[PDB]
Protein backbone atom coordinates (compact mmCIF):
# COMPACT_ATOMS: atom_id res chain seq x y z
CA UNK A 1 0.00 0.00 0.00
CA UNK A 2 2.57 2.57 1.08
CA UNK A 3 6.50 2.26 -0.41
CA UNK A 4 9.20 1.47 2.13
CA UNK A 5 12.37 2.80 0.69
CA UNK A 6 15.23 0.42 1.11
CA UNK A 7 17.61 1.88 3.55
CA UNK A 8 21.07 3.30 2.32
CA UNK A 9 23.81 0.94 1.63
CA UNK A 10 26.56 1.76 4.32
CA UNK A 11 30.06 1.52 3.95
CA UNK A 12 31.75 -0.84 6.70
CA UNK A 13 35.78 -0.32 6.10
CA UNK A 14 38.30 -2.19 8.08
CA UNK A 15 39.31 -0.88 11.32
CA UNK A 16 41.32 -2.31 13.60
CA UNK A 17 39.53 -1.84 17.59
CA UNK A 18 41.36 -1.78 20.33
CA UNK A 19 40.95 -4.23 23.13
CA UNK A 20 37.53 -5.92 23.31
CA UNK A 21 35.33 -2.28 22.29
CA UNK A 22 32.11 -2.72 20.33
CA UNK A 23 32.18 -1.95 16.52
CA UNK A 24 30.82 1.76 16.33
CA UNK A 25 29.68 1.19 12.52
CA UNK A 26 28.25 -2.19 13.98
CA UNK A 27 26.36 0.13 16.57
CA UNK A 28 25.47 2.72 13.79
CA UNK A 29 23.81 -0.08 12.26
CA UNK A 30 22.12 -1.88 14.58
CA UNK A 31 20.22 1.36 15.46
CA UNK A 32 19.82 2.10 12.07
CA UNK A 33 17.10 -0.63 12.26
CA UNK A 34 16.43 -4.52 11.65
CA UNK A 35 17.23 -4.84 8.43
CA UNK A 36 20.37 -2.02 6.63
CA UNK A 37 22.70 -2.36 3.42
CA UNK A 38 26.16 -2.60 3.64
CA UNK A 39 29.27 -2.86 1.62
CA UNK A 40 32.64 -4.11 2.81
CA UNK A 41 36.21 -3.86 1.87
CA UNK A 42 36.21 -6.69 -0.46
CA UNK A 43 33.95 -8.39 -3.23
CA UNK A 44 31.35 -6.41 -4.99
CA UNK A 45 28.09 -4.71 -4.34
CA UNK A 46 26.04 -4.99 -1.21
CA UNK A 47 24.54 -6.92 1.08
CA UNK A 48 21.76 -6.94 3.27
CA UNK A 49 22.35 -7.08 7.14
CA UNK A 50 20.22 -8.37 10.23
CA UNK A 51 21.06 -7.28 13.89
CA UNK A 52 18.12 -8.31 15.55
CA UNK A 53 18.36 -11.94 17.39
CA UNK A 54 15.17 -13.00 15.90
CA UNK A 55 16.15 -11.99 12.20
CA UNK A 56 19.40 -13.76 13.07
CA UNK A 57 17.98 -17.10 13.55
CA UNK A 58 15.27 -16.81 10.91
CA UNK A 59 18.08 -16.20 7.83
CA UNK A 60 20.56 -19.03 9.27
CA UNK A 61 18.10 -21.39 10.23
CA UNK A 62 15.63 -21.16 7.71
CA UNK A 63 16.04 -23.30 4.13
CA UNK A 64 14.96 -20.21 2.02
CA UNK A 65 18.81 -19.52 2.93
CA UNK A 66 21.54 -20.98 1.42
CA UNK A 67 25.13 -21.05 1.35
CA UNK A 68 26.01 -23.24 -1.84
CA UNK A 69 24.91 -20.25 -3.52
CA UNK A 70 27.07 -18.16 -2.46
CA UNK A 71 30.29 -19.46 -4.48
CA UNK A 72 28.06 -18.14 -7.71
CA UNK A 73 29.11 -14.55 -7.30
CA UNK A 74 31.97 -11.86 -5.60
CA UNK A 75 29.57 -10.94 -2.61
CA UNK A 76 30.93 -8.06 -0.70
CA UNK A 77 33.09 -9.39 2.22
CA UNK A 78 35.56 -8.32 4.89
CA UNK A 79 38.35 -11.06 3.58
CA UNK A 80 40.59 -10.37 1.22
CA UNK A 81 40.61 -13.30 -0.45
CA UNK A 82 37.96 -15.76 -1.37
CA UNK A 83 36.01 -18.39 -3.55
CA UNK A 84 37.45 -21.32 -1.84
CA UNK A 85 37.17 -25.24 -2.11
CA UNK A 86 33.43 -25.64 -2.36
CA UNK A 87 33.93 -29.06 -0.76
CA UNK A 88 34.27 -26.85 2.53
CA UNK A 89 31.48 -27.60 5.01
CA UNK A 90 30.98 -23.88 5.22
CA UNK A 91 29.67 -23.66 1.73
CA UNK A 92 27.92 -26.99 1.81
CA UNK A 93 23.66 -27.35 1.95
CA UNK A 94 21.31 -29.46 3.21
CA UNK A 95 22.01 -32.30 0.10
CA UNK A 96 25.67 -32.82 1.59
CA UNK A 97 26.51 -30.54 4.36
CA UNK A 98 24.02 -32.84 6.84
CA UNK A 99 26.53 -35.75 5.41
CA UNK A 100 29.70 -34.62 6.60
CA UNK A 101 28.04 -32.76 10.41
CA UNK A 102 26.43 -36.53 10.65
CA UNK A 103 29.75 -37.88 10.27
CA UNK A 104 31.64 -36.55 13.27
CA UNK A 105 28.18 -34.59 15.37
CA UNK A 106 28.59 -36.90 18.28
CA UNK A 107 32.30 -36.55 19.46
CA UNK A 108 31.24 -32.86 19.69
CA UNK A 109 28.23 -33.09 21.42
CA UNK A 110 27.91 -32.58 24.99
CA UNK A 111 28.63 -35.77 26.16
CA UNK A 112 30.95 -36.17 22.86
CA UNK A 113 33.27 -33.65 24.22
CA UNK A 114 33.21 -34.91 27.83
CA UNK A 115 35.07 -37.97 26.76
CA UNK A 116 38.33 -35.74 26.78
CA UNK A 117 38.24 -33.56 29.77
CA UNK A 118 40.32 -35.59 32.12
CA UNK A 119 42.94 -35.96 29.48
CA UNK A 120 42.86 -31.97 28.51
CA UNK A 121 43.02 -31.41 32.48
CA UNK A 122 46.14 -32.96 32.61
CA UNK A 123 47.97 -31.70 29.56
CA UNK A 124 46.86 -28.41 30.47
CA UNK A 125 48.00 -28.67 34.37
CA UNK A 126 51.51 -30.23 32.42
CA UNK A 127 51.58 -26.45 30.48
CA UNK A 128 50.58 -24.50 33.57
CA UNK A 129 53.69 -26.17 35.96
CA UNK A 130 55.53 -25.25 32.85
CA UNK A 131 54.96 -21.60 33.35
CA UNK A 132 55.16 -21.37 36.59
CA UNK A 133 58.47 -23.70 36.96
CA UNK A 134 59.84 -20.33 34.09
CA UNK A 135 59.22 -18.15 36.50
CA UNK A 136 56.85 -14.84 36.45
CA UNK A 137 57.06 -12.82 33.45
CA UNK A 138 55.08 -14.64 30.84
CA UNK A 139 52.69 -14.61 27.69
CA UNK A 140 49.98 -16.45 28.70
CA UNK A 141 49.27 -16.82 24.75
CA UNK A 142 52.14 -18.55 24.36
CA UNK A 143 52.62 -20.49 27.25
CA UNK A 144 48.93 -21.43 27.49
CA UNK A 145 46.31 -20.10 25.82
CA UNK A 146 47.82 -21.38 21.73
CA UNK A 147 49.11 -24.83 22.60
CA UNK A 148 46.24 -25.87 24.85
CA UNK A 149 43.55 -25.78 22.30
CA UNK A 150 45.98 -27.90 19.59
CA UNK A 151 46.72 -30.48 22.66
CA UNK A 152 42.68 -31.04 22.73
CA UNK A 153 41.92 -31.06 19.47
CA UNK A 154 44.72 -33.67 18.66
CA UNK A 155 43.17 -35.71 21.29
CA UNK A 156 39.59 -35.72 20.51
CA UNK A 157 40.63 -36.26 16.81
CA UNK A 158 42.51 -39.57 18.12
CA UNK A 159 46.20 -38.47 16.29
CA UNK A 160 48.35 -40.70 17.12
CA UNK A 161 51.07 -39.78 19.80
CA UNK A 162 54.25 -39.74 17.69
CA UNK A 163 52.28 -37.35 15.25
CA UNK A 164 51.05 -34.85 17.88
CA UNK A 165 54.33 -32.74 17.69
CA UNK A 166 53.92 -32.60 13.73
CA UNK A 167 50.32 -31.61 14.01
CA UNK A 168 51.11 -28.86 16.74
CA UNK A 169 53.42 -27.38 13.86
CA UNK A 170 51.60 -27.73 10.57
CA UNK A 171 48.80 -25.53 12.56
CA UNK A 172 50.87 -22.73 13.55
CA UNK A 173 52.47 -22.66 10.02
CA UNK A 174 48.97 -22.70 8.37
CA UNK A 175 47.42 -19.67 7.54
CA UNK A 176 49.50 -17.95 10.47
CA UNK A 177 53.14 -17.37 9.99
CA UNK A 178 56.14 -16.12 8.33
CA UNK A 179 56.81 -16.91 4.49
CA UNK A 180 52.90 -16.28 4.02
CA UNK A 181 51.52 -18.49 1.23
CA UNK A 182 54.82 -20.76 0.56
CA UNK A 183 55.05 -22.01 4.23
CA UNK A 184 51.34 -21.78 4.78
CA UNK A 185 50.17 -23.40 1.63
CA UNK A 186 52.87 -26.18 2.09
CA UNK A 187 51.93 -27.17 6.09
CA UNK A 188 48.08 -27.35 4.71
CA UNK A 189 49.34 -29.64 2.21
CA UNK A 190 50.58 -31.83 4.61
CA UNK A 191 47.99 -31.66 6.84
CA UNK A 192 46.41 -32.50 4.03
CA UNK A 193 48.06 -35.70 3.25
CA UNK A 194 48.28 -36.72 6.79
CA UNK A 195 44.66 -36.96 7.71
CA UNK A 196 44.36 -38.62 4.37
CA UNK A 197 46.07 -41.46 5.17
CA UNK A 198 44.98 -41.63 9.14
CA UNK A 199 41.14 -41.55 7.99
CA UNK A 200 41.66 -44.06 4.90
CA UNK A 201 43.32 -46.17 7.55
CA UNK A 202 40.69 -45.46 9.66
CA UNK A 203 37.80 -47.03 6.67
CA UNK A 204 36.66 -49.27 9.10
CA UNK A 205 37.37 -48.10 12.17
CA UNK A 206 34.65 -48.26 15.30
CA UNK A 207 36.81 -46.21 17.10
CA UNK A 208 34.97 -42.80 18.39
CA UNK A 209 37.99 -40.31 18.12
CA UNK A 210 36.63 -37.94 15.11
CA UNK A 211 39.20 -39.44 12.39
CA UNK A 212 38.17 -42.85 13.12
CA UNK A 213 34.45 -41.46 12.66
CA UNK A 214 35.60 -39.15 9.72
CA UNK A 215 37.10 -43.00 8.19
CA UNK A 216 33.94 -45.29 9.09
CA UNK A 217 31.71 -42.69 7.27
CA UNK A 218 33.73 -42.37 4.44
CA UNK A 219 34.13 -46.57 4.33
CA UNK A 220 30.43 -46.84 4.57
CA UNK A 221 30.40 -44.22 1.39
CA UNK A 222 28.71 -41.31 3.41
CA UNK A 223 31.45 -39.23 2.73
CA UNK A 224 33.89 -39.12 0.49
CA UNK A 225 37.80 -39.25 1.75
CA UNK A 226 38.09 -35.40 0.02
CA UNK A 227 35.05 -34.15 1.86
CA UNK A 228 36.76 -35.90 5.42
CA UNK A 229 39.72 -34.87 5.25
CA UNK A 230 39.12 -31.22 3.87
CA UNK A 231 36.78 -30.79 7.57
CA UNK A 232 39.72 -32.71 9.49
CA UNK A 233 41.69 -30.05 8.82
CA UNK A 234 39.06 -27.42 9.34
CA UNK A 235 38.66 -28.94 13.07
CA UNK A 236 42.43 -29.68 13.37
CA UNK A 237 42.92 -25.61 13.09
CA UNK A 238 40.06 -24.42 14.37
CA UNK A 239 41.16 -24.33 17.87
CA UNK A 240 42.53 -20.72 17.66
CA UNK A 241 39.32 -19.32 17.91
CA UNK A 242 39.54 -20.85 21.49
CA UNK A 243 43.12 -19.04 21.80
CA UNK A 244 41.72 -15.63 20.61
CA UNK A 245 38.22 -15.93 22.48
CA UNK A 246 40.17 -17.01 25.73
CA UNK A 247 42.23 -14.83 25.34
CA UNK A 248 39.66 -11.62 25.09
CA UNK A 249 38.13 -13.47 28.23
CA UNK A 250 41.61 -13.61 30.60
CA UNK A 251 42.00 -9.90 29.30
CA UNK A 252 38.86 -9.39 30.84
CA UNK A 253 39.28 -10.71 33.64
CA UNK A 254 42.46 -9.47 34.48
CA UNK A 255 41.85 -5.59 33.63
CA UNK A 256 38.27 -5.94 35.70
CA UNK A 257 38.98 -7.45 38.89
CA UNK A 258 35.85 -7.89 39.97
CA UNK A 259 35.14 -10.52 37.09
CA UNK A 260 38.01 -12.40 38.70
CA UNK A 261 37.55 -11.72 42.18
CA UNK A 262 34.00 -13.59 41.35
CA UNK A 263 35.39 -16.33 39.72
CA UNK A 264 37.58 -16.77 42.66
CA UNK A 265 34.93 -16.39 45.40
CA UNK A 266 31.77 -18.81 43.71
CA UNK A 267 33.60 -21.50 41.44
CA UNK A 268 30.24 -22.73 40.64
CA UNK A 269 29.29 -19.78 39.02
CA UNK A 270 32.29 -20.39 36.60
CA UNK A 271 30.11 -21.96 33.87
CA UNK A 272 27.34 -19.94 33.34
CA UNK A 273 30.48 -16.60 33.93
CA UNK A 274 31.67 -18.60 30.49
CA UNK A 275 28.68 -18.37 28.81
CA UNK A 276 28.29 -14.99 29.71
CA UNK A 277 31.78 -13.93 28.56
CA UNK A 278 30.94 -15.84 25.30
CA UNK A 279 28.48 -14.04 24.54
CA UNK A 280 29.78 -10.38 25.16
CA UNK A 281 32.90 -10.79 23.64
CA UNK A 282 33.02 -9.41 20.09
CA UNK A 283 34.81 -12.47 18.43
CA UNK A 284 34.89 -11.11 15.21
CA UNK A 285 35.67 -8.19 12.90
CA UNK A 286 32.48 -7.17 10.71
CA UNK A 287 30.97 -10.17 9.43
CA UNK A 288 31.85 -13.83 8.33
CA UNK A 289 29.97 -15.69 5.88
CA UNK A 290 26.84 -14.73 3.96
CA UNK A 291 23.57 -16.49 3.12
CA UNK A 292 22.05 -16.23 -0.29
CA UNK A 293 17.94 -16.01 -0.30
CA UNK A 294 16.98 -18.93 -2.91
CA UNK A 295 13.78 -17.53 -3.03
CA UNK A 296 12.06 -13.93 -1.98
CA UNK A 297 11.53 -13.68 1.76
CA UNK A 298 10.32 -10.61 3.91
CA UNK A 299 11.99 -9.55 6.56
CA UNK A 300 10.72 -6.35 9.08
CA UNK A 301 8.66 -5.51 6.26
CA UNK A 302 11.52 -5.73 3.74
CA UNK A 303 11.79 -7.42 0.72
CA UNK A 304 14.85 -9.34 0.22
CA UNK A 305 15.07 -10.53 -3.59
CA UNK A 306 15.77 -13.85 -4.18
CA UNK A 307 19.78 -13.65 -5.22
CA UNK A 308 20.28 -11.33 -2.61
CA UNK A 309 23.24 -11.81 -0.05
CA UNK A 310 22.58 -11.38 3.21
CA UNK A 311 24.49 -11.30 6.42
CA UNK A 312 23.86 -11.81 10.13
CA UNK A 313 25.92 -10.39 12.90
CA UNK A 314 25.88 -12.54 16.37
CA UNK A 315 27.65 -9.83 17.64
CA UNK A 316 24.99 -7.74 17.51
CA UNK A 317 22.29 -10.22 18.12
CA UNK A 318 23.95 -11.32 21.73
CA UNK A 319 23.83 -7.48 22.47
CA UNK A 320 19.84 -7.46 21.54
CA UNK A 321 18.24 -5.49 24.36
CA UNK A 322 15.07 -7.70 24.05
CA UNK A 323 16.58 -10.88 24.75
CA UNK A 324 19.76 -9.71 26.91
CA UNK A 325 18.75 -6.95 29.13
CA UNK A 326 21.38 -4.29 29.78
CA UNK A 327 23.40 -6.44 26.87
CA UNK A 328 26.16 -4.27 27.25
CA UNK A 329 26.55 -5.23 31.30
CA UNK A 330 29.13 -7.94 31.48
CA UNK A 331 26.14 -10.42 34.54
CA UNK A 332 27.33 -13.77 35.89
CA UNK A 333 24.43 -14.38 36.74
CA UNK A 334 22.17 -13.66 33.53
CA UNK A 335 19.58 -16.28 34.05
CA UNK A 336 18.35 -17.27 30.47
CA UNK A 337 21.52 -16.09 28.26
CA UNK A 338 20.48 -17.74 24.28
CA UNK A 339 23.78 -16.51 22.66
CA UNK A 340 24.68 -17.06 19.66
CA UNK A 341 28.08 -17.06 20.03
CA UNK A 342 28.59 -20.03 18.33
CA UNK A 343 26.02 -19.25 15.35
CA UNK A 344 22.56 -21.01 14.63
CA UNK A 345 21.19 -22.97 12.08
CA UNK A 346 22.66 -25.93 10.52
CA UNK A 347 26.32 -23.93 9.99
CA UNK A 348 26.35 -23.48 14.06
CA UNK A 349 29.54 -24.11 15.36
CA UNK A 350 30.68 -28.20 15.95
CA UNK A 351 33.17 -26.90 18.30
CA UNK A 352 31.07 -24.94 20.48
CA UNK A 353 30.67 -27.73 23.11
CA UNK A 354 34.20 -28.24 23.07
CA UNK A 355 34.99 -24.57 23.30
CA UNK A 356 33.27 -24.48 26.55
CA UNK A 357 35.06 -27.15 27.83
CA UNK A 358 38.40 -25.94 26.91
CA UNK A 359 37.63 -22.31 28.69
CA UNK A 360 35.99 -23.85 32.06
CA UNK A 361 39.66 -26.09 32.75
CA UNK A 362 41.70 -22.90 31.27
CA UNK A 363 39.49 -20.51 33.52
CA UNK A 364 40.08 -23.26 36.48
CA UNK A 365 43.64 -23.62 35.92
CA UNK A 366 44.70 -19.81 35.85
CA UNK A 367 42.38 -18.88 38.06
CA UNK A 368 43.37 -21.27 41.38
CA UNK A 369 47.02 -22.19 40.33
CA UNK A 370 48.76 -19.00 39.36
CA UNK A 371 49.40 -16.85 42.75
CA UNK A 372 48.70 -12.75 42.46
CA UNK A 373 47.90 -12.87 38.62
CA UNK A 374 47.23 -9.63 37.37
CA UNK A 375 48.31 -8.13 34.08
CA UNK A 376 51.94 -7.59 33.36
CA UNK A 377 50.91 -4.02 31.11
CA UNK A 378 48.28 -1.28 31.66
CA UNK A 379 45.41 -2.97 29.64
CA UNK A 380 45.43 -0.64 26.85
CA UNK A 381 49.29 -1.67 26.16
CA UNK A 382 47.65 -5.61 25.61
CA UNK A 383 48.31 -6.06 21.62
CA UNK A 384 45.81 -7.24 19.54
CA UNK A 385 45.41 -8.91 16.39
CA UNK A 386 45.43 -5.94 13.66
CA UNK A 387 44.22 -6.91 10.18
CA UNK A 388 42.37 -10.35 11.31
CA UNK A 389 39.00 -11.76 11.10
CA UNK A 390 38.92 -13.43 14.36
CA UNK A 391 39.89 -10.47 17.16
CA UNK A 392 41.77 -11.30 20.34
CA UNK A 393 45.23 -10.70 21.71
CA UNK A 394 48.31 -11.07 19.76
CA UNK A 395 50.17 -11.71 23.36
CA UNK A 396 48.44 -11.50 27.06
CA UNK A 397 51.71 -10.47 29.06
CA UNK A 398 50.87 -11.35 32.75
CA UNK A 399 53.04 -11.38 35.96
CA UNK A 400 52.49 -13.11 39.31
CA UNK A 401 54.61 -14.01 42.80
CA UNK A 402 57.13 -16.59 41.99
C1 LIG B 1 34.81 -19.75 21.52
C2 LIG B 1 35.43 -20.40 20.26
C3 LIG B 1 34.58 -20.42 18.97
C4 LIG B 1 33.64 -19.54 18.49
C5 LIG B 1 33.12 -18.22 19.11
C6 LIG B 1 33.18 -20.08 17.21
C7 LIG B 1 32.26 -19.48 16.42
C8 LIG B 1 31.79 -19.91 15.21
C9 LIG B 1 30.82 -19.23 14.37
C10 LIG B 1 30.15 -17.90 14.72
C11 LIG B 1 30.65 -19.97 13.26
C12 LIG B 1 29.75 -19.67 12.04
C13 LIG B 1 28.34 -20.24 12.03
C14 LIG B 1 27.65 -19.90 10.71
O1 LIG B 1 28.22 -20.16 9.65
O2 LIG B 1 26.51 -19.34 10.81
C15 LIG B 1 31.52 -21.14 13.39
C16 LIG B 1 31.65 -22.15 12.47
C17 LIG B 1 32.48 -23.26 12.56
N1 LIG B 1 33.32 -23.52 13.64
FE1 LIG B 1 33.56 -22.42 15.28
N2 LIG B 1 33.84 -21.28 16.93
C18 LIG B 1 34.68 -21.50 18.00
C19 LIG B 1 35.52 -22.61 18.08
C20 LIG B 1 35.63 -23.63 17.14
C21 LIG B 1 36.52 -24.79 17.28
C22 LIG B 1 37.46 -25.02 18.50
C23 LIG B 1 36.35 -25.55 16.18
C24 LIG B 1 37.04 -26.88 15.79
C25 LIG B 1 36.61 -28.10 16.64
C26 LIG B 1 35.36 -24.88 15.35
C27 LIG B 1 34.90 -25.32 14.12
C28 LIG B 1 33.97 -24.71 13.32
C29 LIG B 1 33.50 -25.20 12.03
C30 LIG B 1 34.00 -26.49 11.36
C31 LIG B 1 32.58 -24.31 11.56
C32 LIG B 1 31.79 -24.40 10.25
C33 LIG B 1 30.45 -25.17 10.52
C34 LIG B 1 29.54 -25.33 9.31
O3 LIG B 1 29.49 -24.38 8.52
O4 LIG B 1 28.89 -26.38 9.19
N3 LIG B 1 34.93 -23.72 15.95
N4 LIG B 1 32.20 -21.07 14.58
Same mark, same amino acid.
Given at each position: ?? #?? +??????????????????????????????????????????????????????????? =????? +???? %???? %?????????????????????????? #??????????????????????????????????????????? #?????????????? !????????????????? $????????????????????????????????????????????????? $??????????????? +??????????????? =????????????? &?????????????????????????????????????????????????????????? !??? &???? %?????????????????????????????????????????????????????????????????????
Amino acid at each position: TI #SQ +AVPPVRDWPAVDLPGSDFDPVLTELMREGPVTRISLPNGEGWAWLVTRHDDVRLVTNDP =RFGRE +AVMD %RQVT %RLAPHFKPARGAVGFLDPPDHTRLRR #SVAAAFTARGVERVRERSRGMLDELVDAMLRAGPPADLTEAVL #SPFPIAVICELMGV !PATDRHSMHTWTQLILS $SSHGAEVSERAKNEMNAYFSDLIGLRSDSAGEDVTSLLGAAVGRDEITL $SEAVGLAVLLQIGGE +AVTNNSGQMFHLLLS =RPELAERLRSEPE &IRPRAIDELLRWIPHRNAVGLSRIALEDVEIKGVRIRAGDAVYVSYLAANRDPEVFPD !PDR &IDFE %RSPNPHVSFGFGPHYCPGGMLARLESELLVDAVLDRVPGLKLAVAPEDVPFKKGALIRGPEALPVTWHH
